[model samples]
Target: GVALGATRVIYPAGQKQVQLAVTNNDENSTYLIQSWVENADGVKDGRFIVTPPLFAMKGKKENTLRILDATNNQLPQDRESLFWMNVKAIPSMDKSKLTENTLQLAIISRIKLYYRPAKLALPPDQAAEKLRFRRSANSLTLINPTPYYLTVTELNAGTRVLENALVPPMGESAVKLSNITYRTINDYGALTPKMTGVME
Candidate 1:
């Protein structure tokens, strides 16, 4: 097993590099570590570079991995871009078990990577306050006026759990809540009329 220093990674706009710390917790086992960045759909994203793409970690040892933005100038500079950081650990076996049909277990961990542009209409923490929600004929609409992506994990209207939703920066997302009515919509962030989970 391994331990990650953080649950999320943040790449500030214009930054050259970022670092993540990984530690091997197994006292007697060694692991081969591989790190990569990909999109939500599991497609490989070449915009980022992870140094030492593959390495060996001895038991109770730790290492810092470097992440560089290969795109440098290609990604959006107005809104946030989302990616996944995956770290896989493949255990090294003893030579005695080097049979052709031997089986080994590999562990993989994933975390969210957020690329935040330097300039935005508002800070991420405050962006939620500017969202607007409205009720249409049979659905709910969420309007994000800031240049930040909003992710909604859970939504509740009074005592009813509405639904999970997302609203892109400076964009709108409509959620179906047909035949359901509530006086107000509260997001996981506790934002009004329109509710969003939180900025990631």
Candidate 2:
């Protein structure tokens, strides 16, 4: 029903605002977007405000959404904080006489919005590569020591791939041991795993 310009958004520390595009893909239908920000828990948050919080767009048209931050420096300074930018696109029924054209659809297009503070020691990709992997009998525990959200899009050992595994800052995530095939000898260097992802 709708498309976002970017796959994700990252608001760095001291940044005042960020912008994104909202596009209506169908050339014959209209969509109304109810945009808002909520925390990772789905609770409404007020640290950032959306411009034109409610609006309508013509078919095939694109509009922009501005997120203004007024967090008062209250967001965490040591790690990245996350929120969901939800743009609920509700389809509108046309003024058509044909009853068959009266069907309306609703979709919630959500994107991860991250507030990155100044203290994150390493860049996202660096932090992603720095993850510590511990393989157990049936599972693998990934430990994150940096203060950033590590979105592992591709964590692979050979052809075995683990996609979309998110580990929080200073947090740990466990994945099936089948995906990890390498190991490290005690205190010695070991083989590297292929990991691809974005940081916020």
Overall lDDT per candidate, in order of appearance: 0.73, 0.72
Q: Estimate the TM-score of every prediction.
A: 0.77, 0.79
Flag regions of model 1 displaced more than 4 Å. 94-103, 136-138, 174-200
Residue pairs clashing in model 1 are 152-197
| Candidate 1 deviation (Cα RMSD) | 5.4
Q: Total clashes, candidate 1?
A: 1
Model 2 misplaced regions, further than 4 Å: 94-103, 157-163, 178-200
Model 1 residue 115 CA deviation (Å) reads: 1.5
Which candidate's TM-score is highest?
2
lDDT of 1 by residue, 67-153 (tens): 888875888888877788988998876698676677777888887777888877676667656767777668777777777666654
Q: In candidate 1, residue 76 scores what lDDT?
A: 84
Error of 2 at 43 (Å): 1.2
